[PDB]
Amino acid sequence: VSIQAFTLEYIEEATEKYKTLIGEGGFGPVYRGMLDDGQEVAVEVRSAFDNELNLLSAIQHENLVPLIGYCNEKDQQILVYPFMSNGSLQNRLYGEPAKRKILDWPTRLSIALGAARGLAYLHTFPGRPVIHRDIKSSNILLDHSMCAKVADFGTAGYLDPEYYTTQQLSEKSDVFSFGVVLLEIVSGREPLDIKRPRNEWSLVEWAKPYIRASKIEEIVDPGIKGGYHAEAMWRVVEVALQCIEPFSAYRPCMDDIVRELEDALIIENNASE
Numbered sequence: 281v282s283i284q285a286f287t288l289e290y291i292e293e294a295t296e297k298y299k300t301l302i303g304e305g306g307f308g309p310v311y312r313g314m315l316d317d318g319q320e321v322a323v324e325v326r327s328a329f330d331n332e333l334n335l336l337s338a339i340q341h342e343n344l345v346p347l348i349g350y351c352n353e354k355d356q357q358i359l360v361y362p363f364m365s366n367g368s369l370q371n372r373l374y375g376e377p378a379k380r381k382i383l384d385w386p387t388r389l390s391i392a393l394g395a396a397r398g399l400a401y402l403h404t405f406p407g408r409p410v411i412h413r414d415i416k417s418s419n420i421l422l423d424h425s426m427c428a429k430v431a432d433f434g435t436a437g438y439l440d441p442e443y444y445t446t447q448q449l450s451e452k453s454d455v456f457s458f459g460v461v462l463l464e465i466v467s468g469r470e471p472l473d474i475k476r477p478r479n480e481w482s483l484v485e486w487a488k489p490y491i492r493a494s495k496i497e498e499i500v501d502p503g504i505k506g507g508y509h510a511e512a513m514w515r516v517v518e519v520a521l522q523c524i525e526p527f528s529a530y531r532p533c534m535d536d537i538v539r540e541l542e543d544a545l546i547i548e549n550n551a552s553e
């Protein structure tokens with residue numbers, strides 16, 4: 281809840297000399313470490329600011345990756361986040377772990393609502409908005425409790441088509457991108473896959489017809505076939521379609537998405553009990 285300054289020496293002790301590399305992150309590599317109090321951290325090292333730290337200091341929401349501290353020493357720019365032990369939504373949908381454990385519909389729903397709330401907090405931020413501009417399943421991280429934490433708010437298949445007119449990314453561009461994420465969550469497919477039959481190359485182009493023709497069962501992840509209530513799935517698919525409208529003007533705000541995703545989870549929780 282409060283940002284700390286670390287020394288390079290401390291980051292090296294925690295990181296065991298960058299022994300582990302958690303993965304490619306936005307604006308630098310990210311290594312795994314443990315602080316001397318025992319909490320697991322991810323340490324982002326800028327490849328190549330104090331205003332950014334103040335912005336990141338000002339962002340506080342349960343569905344955003346929080347900043348623990350930073351390192352300023354010797355013209356280095358290091359950022360320290362909690363380690364998210366359950367990894368990325370992308371990985372749990374069609375990653376290696378998806379072959380072991382199938383993420384169930386209610387959990388998928390709960391992760392989407394979490395992520396939407398995080399983005400909603402950023403979009404409606406007092407004074408000026410915070411726009412992510414690179415929303416994707418790999419940037420929706422999961423903690424021990426499978427609570428969504430959106431990352432890299434400091435990609436082909438997700439890019440707002442309208443960007444080719446405006447050459448600008450906006451809240452509405454984040455909304456389009458999120459719509460593609462909702463399609464991943466429903467379908468269990470990555471947006472772009474050349475190895476798929478030609479008609480299935482684009483998840484977005486492939487899906488719209490079936491949704492438009494009210495035949496959602498065809499596009500649903502086999503692992504959650506008969507694992508959802510139709511009323512709840514309709515809501516998610518419907519709002520997903522509005523998000524991926526080629527023209528931002530017809531696209532809902534993130535907060536309309538929050539409400540639809542809340543409605544879907546109340547429908548499932550109601551039928552579950």
Ligand SMILES: C[As](C)(=O)[O-]
Nearest residue numbers: 335407408409410
């Ligand atoms: C990027 As801001 C905290 O001025 O809305």
Ligand SMILES: [Ca+2]
Nearest residue numbers: 400401404535
């Ligand atoms: Ca608000």
